[PDB]
Ligand binder design. Structure first.
Ligand SMILES: *[C@@H]1O[C@H](CO)[C@@H](O[C@@H]2O[C@H](CO)[C@@H](O[C@@H]3O[C@H](CO)[C@@H](O)[C@H](O[C@H]4O[C@H](CO)[C@@H](O)[C@H](O)[C@@H]4O)[C@@H]3O)[C@H](O)[C@H]2NC(C)=O)[C@H](O)[C@H]1NC(C)=O
Ligand SMILES: *[C@@H]1O[C@H](CO)[C@@H](O[C@@H]2O[C@H](CO)[C@@H](O)[C@H](O)[C@H]2NC(C)=O)[C@H](O)[C@H]1NC(C)=O
Ligand SMILES: *[C@@H]1O[C@H](CO)[C@@H](O)[C@H](O)[C@H]1NC(C)=O
Ligand SMILES: *[C@@H]1O[C@H](CO)[C@@H](O)[C@H](O)[C@H]1NC(C)=O
Ligand SMILES: *[C@@H]1O[C@H](CO)[C@@H](O)[C@H](O)[C@H]1NC(C)=O
Ligand SMILES: *[C@@H]1O[C@H](CO)[C@@H](O)[C@H](O)[C@H]1NC(C)=O
Ligand SMILES: *[C@@H]1O[C@H](CO)[C@@H](O)[C@H](O)[C@H]1NC(C)=O
Ligand SMILES: *[C@@H]1O[C@H](CO)[C@@H](O)[C@H](O)[C@H]1NC(C)=O
Ligand SMILES: *[C@@H]1O[C@H](CO)[C@@H](O)[C@H](O)[C@H]1NC(C)=O
Ligand SMILES: *[C@@H]1O[C@H](CO)[C@@H](O)[C@H](O)[C@H]1NC(C)=O
Ligand SMILES: *[C@@H]1O[C@H](CO)[C@@H](O)[C@H](O)[C@H]1NC(C)=O
Ligand SMILES: *[C@@H]1O[C@H](CO)[C@@H](O)[C@H](O)[C@H]1NC(C)=O
Ligand SMILES: *[C@@H]1O[C@H](CO)[C@@H](O)[C@H](O)[C@H]1NC(C)=O
Ligand SMILES: *[C@@H]1O[C@H](CO)[C@@H](O)[C@H](O)[C@H]1NC(C)=O
Ligand SMILES: *[C@@H]1O[C@H](CO)[C@@H](O)[C@H](O)[C@H]1NC(C)=O
Ligand SMILES: *[C@@H]1O[C@H](CO)[C@@H](O)[C@H](O)[C@H]1NC(C)=O
Ligand SMILES: *[C@@H]1O[C@H](CO)[C@@H](O)[C@H](O)[C@H]1NC(C)=O
Ligand SMILES: *[C@@H]1O[C@H](CO)[C@@H](O)[C@H](O)[C@H]1NC(C)=O
Ligand SMILES: *[C@@H]1O[C@H](CO)[C@@H](O)[C@H](O)[C@H]1NC(C)=O
Ligand SMILES: *[C@@H]1O[C@H](CO)[C@@H](O)[C@H](O)[C@H]1NC(C)=O
Ligand SMILES: *[C@@H]1O[C@H](CO)[C@@H](O)[C@H](O)[C@H]1NC(C)=O
Ligand SMILES: *[C@@H]1O[C@H](CO)[C@@H](O)[C@H](O)[C@H]1NC(C)=O
Ligand SMILES: *[C@@H]1O[C@H](CO)[C@@H](O)[C@H](O)[C@H]1NC(C)=O
Ligand SMILES: *[C@@H]1O[C@H](CO)[C@@H](O)[C@H](O)[C@H]1NC(C)=O
Ligand SMILES: *[C@@H]1O[C@H](CO)[C@@H](O)[C@H](O)[C@H]1NC(C)=O
Ligand SMILES: *[C@@H]1O[C@H](CO)[C@@H](O)[C@H](O)[C@H]1NC(C)=O
Ligand SMILES: *[C@@H]1O[C@H](CO)[C@@H](O)[C@H](O)[C@H]1NC(C)=O
Ligand SMILES: *[C@@H]1O[C@H](CO)[C@@H](O)[C@H](O)[C@H]1NC(C)=O
Ligand SMILES: *[C@@H]1O[C@H](CO)[C@@H](O)[C@H](O)[C@H]1NC(C)=O
Ligand SMILES: *[C@@H]1O[C@H](CO)[C@@H](O)[C@H](O)[C@H]1NC(C)=O
Lengths: 436, 123, 120, 120, 120, 48, 48
């Protein structure tokens, strides 16, 4: 009775992993080989479609990760390799008199370095932070990178301010956006819509506290691959932001010398005024309310008769123990011990920060970068939009954890899925082809 | 529930024209094929014309192929048959009916599912 | 609606938007490889439609009967109460069988047409 | 003449050289990208001809009437006293309108053919 | 048999496996260039079949008579006692002549069809 | 034996100051120059 | 025995055996390996 009829252009798709395109509106994140965005991108709501999403298997996170690493290296490759800087240094404390917390953090070091001509040497005096200088045993010191790899100086003209990057599907593929309020990262979405491209995602690099991200639609959303498994990180998306203000209140001078033909080294010079500690101010009431909301949502997974305690991160490298971010070209490392110090049973906070010039990003070994000093006083005001927590019995203990950068990008890409279109199919039809 | 009412003219002289329209209610008009069937005063039934559900594809009996036009408006729920020449042999009660065709994705019909009351066209 | 707007619609209604998805099928080394693979996929689908005797058509009727084992649903049930995603899952296991039959049907048709043309 | 030899000829005469230009349409990373884009362009034009129901034809008649607002020239005036470059400029603003109508016409034709085939 | 299994078979028998080789025609910078060139070759063959008026067909009859100078073998001799490799060598020198005639034949056919359609 | 096909009754408008072929030729010359002279000798110990 | 040209003495002759001949090489010295660093991120390994 019925015959096979072939249809082409059928709105059917399958899960797929493919290469994505950039879209955008000198910055380290500004790619020349990256197409301009669509000023009026399209979004087509899919009625009566319940697509299953799983943010922990989303290939877009690995693609974004690789794109960030490649762009970073391409941008910082054509600069200055400070191979003649790995020399013995003679160092004393910058301010003997100072009794402030910043005592011995800044050291006044002398070294020979090089000059334009091979046959000449000079004497260079510069200031270094304690975190960049390791004792050999006026004392002799070496830079921390001398025991790992050669260090490349970032070009001073390159800005590190995040620029939103939009990801676009190649033809033959489509991106599905969950749009389901309070979606926890896995399972069906009831409000799925098809888009050509994602919204802009800022490649903000941070740990423990996620800055300048998206907010939850109605309430704090706690997402995890496995709540029971203590080895997984918990991504907490806040519904309201917490404003955080960091300052580097020292009018720091920047000096430079030439080190070879076509090469110059920039270094931290005189500190004018008093030497002061870098720090962030977070309002106590806002943080306390935000943390209480997080506790309530955790109780929904652990019970109404449990105890939720926050504690400081365990010992380890500075890059993972404490909060870390790029502020005005400087790389800040803070503490957070005053944020996660509370037991929950059913006007400003000041966090100290240290600045480090020898940078080892993305958890790579042997990829040291020298961040040039930034002249003057630096201030940044950021929005805290999410947290990373790990879990350590009546009392559960949570710690900031973090350190794996894909967790930050996943926190933005969780709403998107890439699918491949399979336009060809068959169906019974009461239609016979004319015979011969 | 389902109703079809024919409205049209009365007495026409040979060489003229007459438009007959069937108004439908009680069902989705655009979901069914429509046709016209006529009965001469002293004879049985004979098929006259068939139009599909969309209205773009039509069929006629040879005796009226150059004289009758069948059309439908699915927004007005109206089926219209515009007849020309109208010979003495065309005097008959004309009926509109639902059925007679199905658009490939529907189960087969090849029968006239629902009939109206009819209207008499006299030449 | 636009691209994939009919994805949640019944099989019948979605057949009226076949051209929209078709237009959106075709629309640094890794990106170039992706474009090349998209072209190869498109051509594989066009070649397959060519082999079956459909060529430049979006709706193509054939001479292969429905087995009834592949799916035993009513014709109106399939076209009025199912989406294309559900249908694709329902007959996934028989896709290659159907494709094989379609190829064989066209081969016989081509030979018969040639022999019909050979008659003086 | 050869490729584009008829460019300055009247619209009528140039229709006899449609195959010459067609053959010349298909005939280090930037160069590879250029070849890939040339392939995508060619396929976009072939897909568009497919959607309209023309497929492998260089001259294809359709069922879309001429609006008369797009151009009100006489038929002999257009074919005997104009070149294709002048014509393309003359109706540039109506190109997308015409394309939309052509797509709709083929969709109706396909449904009517399917329903005609469905008759036992 | 599978791909090229009929290569040593007679011309007649091998015509029943035309789809097998066709499927296998389409199936780091140098490798990407190779894929792009394979795509261009495939499209050149498809364009050539389009120009001749064959389009999506594997067996296509035409209106060009056999010259008898190209090959003077009997019809049964060619189809029953030769392979396609031998035939391709036998008429290699006339390939371009045949192709030219095929193009001209289709051009006349298209004009005649257009003029036939123009009759009210 | 390159081909040239004269176009009769064609009056194309040219503008040499907007001709993208000049920038393409420029880039090709710069790239070729650098590719050709890259694998040679860097006289870093000569700056004495 | 395969050759481009047997007569031409400038060509090599490739002889494919139908049976294999087992060959056993040994380096019977318990050689120590030592290493030093030579620069940041670079190390040299040497025979000790
Ligand atoms: C989260 O987003 C906020 C913005 O909503 C962002 O704060 C912004 O940071 C940038 C960079 O630190 C600030 O831009 C600077 O503003 C000062 C104002 O005095 C300027 O002097 C700076 O100019 C320097 O850099 C230029 C190169 O761009 C040089 O040409 C110039 O000579 C100076 O050297 C620069 O424009 C911006 O003002 C703030 N915005 C606000 C509202 O404070 C924050 O950093 C983001 N957080 C994270 C973690 O990314
Ligand atoms: C961040 O600050 C906290 C204090 O608020 C530091 O924690 C203390 O570290 C000392 C060792 O220096 C321990 O003896 C204390 O027991 C720790 N706890 C407290 C409450 O003082 C923490 O080490 C700081 N972070 C870093 C990276 O130094
Ligand atoms: C710089 O080199 C001179 C060479 O005579 C040496 O005496 C001096 O101590 C060096 N400076 C430092 C800081 O090691
Ligand atoms: C030198 O590097 C090694 C790792 O290769 C590390 O374990 C060691 O602590 C480093 N030296 C110092 C003084 O930190
Ligand atoms: C889907 O999101 C839109 C906002 O874009 C909202 O108006 C609509 O109610 C949502 N639907 C559901 C089922 O949540
Ligand atoms: C921070 O949050 C406020 C709302 O509380 C918003 O107006 C502001 O734009 C946010 N800033 C960023 C950088 O997201
Ligand atoms: C955030 O969640 C709390 C939960 O009590 C709610 O009171 C507050 O209004 C929410 N804020 C927004 C902006 O939705
Ligand atoms: C997310 O929601 C789904 C609902 O099916 C549930 O099965 C899953 O365990 C939830 N995951 C978390 C981390 O809450
Ligand atoms: C989650 O982690 C627990 C840890 O004990 C394990 O038993 C459970 O099987 C895990 N669930 C999944 C879905 O992996
Ligand atoms: C830093 O010192 C310079 C000296 O010229 C002065 O102009 C500038 O205002 C100072 N900035 C601060 C924040 O003291
Ligand atoms: C470092 O110490 C020397 C000692 O003579 C002094 O001249 C120099 O100014 C100091 N560095 C800075 C930045 O003040
Ligand atoms: C951060 O700075 C803004 C002014 O830009 C101020 O209103 C806000 O209170 C500051 N936050 C804290 C915690 O001091
Ligand atoms: C503020 O913190 C205290 C603990 O120091 C806690 O008892 C109180 O409930 C918190 N307030 C809110 C609104 O969470
Ligand atoms: C806590 O109590 C509320 C009722 O107030 C209930 O809805 C909720 O499910 C309880 N949570 C747990 C984890 O049992
Ligand atoms: C945490 O709370 C305790 C009181 O329970 C207090 O003594 C301590 O200073 C607080 N801060 C840290 C970093 O432990
Ligand atoms: C969704 O399903 C409902 C079922 O009642 C239907 O009325 C509606 O038209 C459907 N919408 C689509 C497929 O867009
Ligand atoms: C239906 O499929 C079975 C194999 O699953 C086959 O044996 C049977 O002949 C098929 N029916 C028809 C009518 O071809
Ligand atoms: C399918 O058709 C049969 C009659 O052949 C009928 O009994 C059955 O109920 C129908 N099923 C549906 C879902 O229409
Ligand atoms: C396809 O075969 C597998 C065999 O395990 C079976 O589980 C699945 O349900 C089958 N699907 C269909 C649509 O028959
Ligand atoms: C050019 O125009 C003249 C007009 O008199 C015409 O005779 C001639 O054939 C044309 N040549 C072309 C189009 O090659
Ligand atoms: C001609 O185009 C106009 C719109 O510009 C339209 O309103 C009119 O109906 C068209 N004529 C025909 C015959 O379709
Ligand atoms: C076009 O045809 C009309 C007659 O319908 C005639 O009056 C007019 O002159 C013709 N124009 C041209 C250019 O042939
Ligand atoms: C197209 O529209 C523009 C509107 O500014 C007009 O200037 C131009 O002449 C139009 N071209 C045609 C062929 O109608
Ligand atoms: C090979 O040639 C022999 C000739 O006797 C024929 O019988 C056989 O079928 C051929 N086999 C092929 C073409 O595979
Ligand atoms: C056969 O080819 C010759 C040229 O080699 C040609 O002159 C002759 O006319 C051709 N025969 C036919 C029937 O066309
Ligand atoms: C070809 O046919 C002719 C008759 O026209 C016959 O004499 C000749 O022997 C045949 N040759 C072959 C090889 O069949
Ligand atoms: C093609 O022409 C060449 C001319 O040297 C000749 O040697 C060869 O045999 C010819 N081949 C055929 C099949 O006519
Ligand atoms: C290989 O065999 C062929 C057989 O035709 C012979 O002509 C050739 O000389 C041989 N070559 C060698 C190296 O034996
Ligand atoms: C093989 O080498 C000899 C060397 O004298 C030469 O004379 C002969 O022509 C060569 N043969 C070929 C086929 O190259
Ligand atoms: C080489 O010396 C090491 C020393 O630890 C010993 O363990 C090993 O067995 C020796 N090997 C031989 C072959 O003598």
């Amino acid at each position: 009775n019925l015959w096979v009829t072939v249809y082409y252009g059928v709105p059917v798709w399958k899960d797929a992993e493919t290469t994505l395109f950039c879209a955008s509106d000198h910055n380290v994140w500004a790619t020349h080989a990256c197409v301009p965005t669509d000023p009026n991108p399209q979004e087509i709501h899919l009625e009566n479609v319940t697509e299953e999403f799983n943010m922990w298997k989303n290939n877009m996170v690995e693609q974004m990760h690789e794109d960030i690493i490649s762009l970073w290296d391409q941008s910082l490759k054509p600069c200055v390799k400070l191979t003649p800087l790995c020399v013995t240094l003679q160092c004393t404390n910058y301010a003997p008199k100072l009794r402030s917390m910043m005592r011995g953090e800044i050291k006044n070091c002398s070294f020979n370095m090089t000059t334009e001509l091979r046959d000449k040497k000079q004497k260079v005096y510069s200031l270094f932070y304690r975190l960049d200088v390791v004792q050999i045993n006026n004392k002799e010191y070496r830079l921390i990178n001398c025991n790992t790899s050669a260090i490349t100086q970032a070009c001073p003209k390159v800005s590190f301010e995040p620029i939103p990057i939009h990801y676009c599907a190649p033809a033959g593929f489509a991106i599905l956006k969950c749009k389901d309020k309070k979606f926890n990262g896995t399972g069906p979405c009831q409000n799925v819509s098809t888009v050509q491209c994602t919204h802009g995602i800022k490649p903000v690099v941070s740990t423990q506290l996620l800055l300048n991200g998206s907010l939850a639609e109605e309430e704090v959303i706690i997402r995890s691959e496995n709540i029971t498994n203590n080895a997984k990180n918990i991504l907490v998306q806040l519904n309201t932001s917490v404003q955080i203000n960091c300052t580097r209140p020292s009018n720091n001078t920047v000096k430079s010398i030439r080190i070879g033909p076509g090469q110059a080294f920039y270094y931290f010079g005189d500190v004018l005024g008093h030497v002061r500690m870098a720090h962030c101010n977070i309002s106590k009431a806002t943080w306390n309310e935000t943390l209480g909301k997080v506790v309530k949502q955790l109780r929904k997974h652990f019970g109404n008769n449990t105890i939720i305690r926050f504690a400081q991160s365990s010992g380890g490298d500075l890059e993972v123990t404490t909060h870390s971010f790029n502020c005005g070209g400087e790389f800040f490392y803070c503490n957070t011990s005053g944020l996660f110090n509370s037991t929950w049973i059913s006007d400003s906070l000041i966090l100290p920060c240290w600045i480090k010039q020898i940078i080892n990003m993305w958890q790579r070994i042997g990829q040291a970068m020298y961040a040039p000093p930034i002249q003057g006083v630096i201030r940044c005001v950021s929005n805290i939009t999410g947290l990373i927590l790990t879990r350590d019995s009546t009392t559960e203990t949570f710690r900031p954890g973090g350190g794996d950068m894909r967790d930050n990008w996943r926190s933005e890409l969780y709403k998107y899925k890439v699918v491949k279109i399979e336009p060809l199919g068959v169906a019974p039809t009461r239609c016979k082809r004319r015979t011969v | 529930e389902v109703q079809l009412v024919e409205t049209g003219g009365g007495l026409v002289q040979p060489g003229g024209s007459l438009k007959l329209s069937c108004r439908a209610s009680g069902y989705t008009f655009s979901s069914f094929a429509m046709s016209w069937v006529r009965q001469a005063p002293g004879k049985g039934l004979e098929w006259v014309s068939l139009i599909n559900d969309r209205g773009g594809l039509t069929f006629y009996v040879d005796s009226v192929k150059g004289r009758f036009t069948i059309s439908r408006d699915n927004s007005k729920n109206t089926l219209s048959l515009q007849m020309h020449s109208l010979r003495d042999g065309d005097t008959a009660v004309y009926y509109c009916a639902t059925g007679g065709m199905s658009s490939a994705l529907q189960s087969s019909k090849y029968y006239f599912d629902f009939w109206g009351q009819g209207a008499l066209v006299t030449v | 609606d636009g691209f994939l707007g009919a994805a949640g619609s019944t099989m019948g209604a979605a057949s009226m938007t076949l051209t929209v998805q078709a237009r959106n099928l075709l629309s640094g080394i890794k990106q170039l490889q992706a474009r090349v693979l998209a072209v190869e996929h498109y051509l594989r689908d066009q070649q397959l439609l060519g082999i079956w005797g459909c060529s430049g058509k979006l709706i193509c009727c054939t001479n292969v009967p429905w087995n009834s084992s592949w799916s035993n649903r009513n014709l109106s049930e399939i076209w009025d109460n199912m989406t294309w995603l559900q249908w694709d899952k329902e007959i996934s296991n028989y896709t290659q069988i159907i494709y094989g039959l379609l190829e064989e049907s066209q081969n016989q048709q081509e030979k018969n047409e040639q022999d019909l043309l050979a008659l003086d």
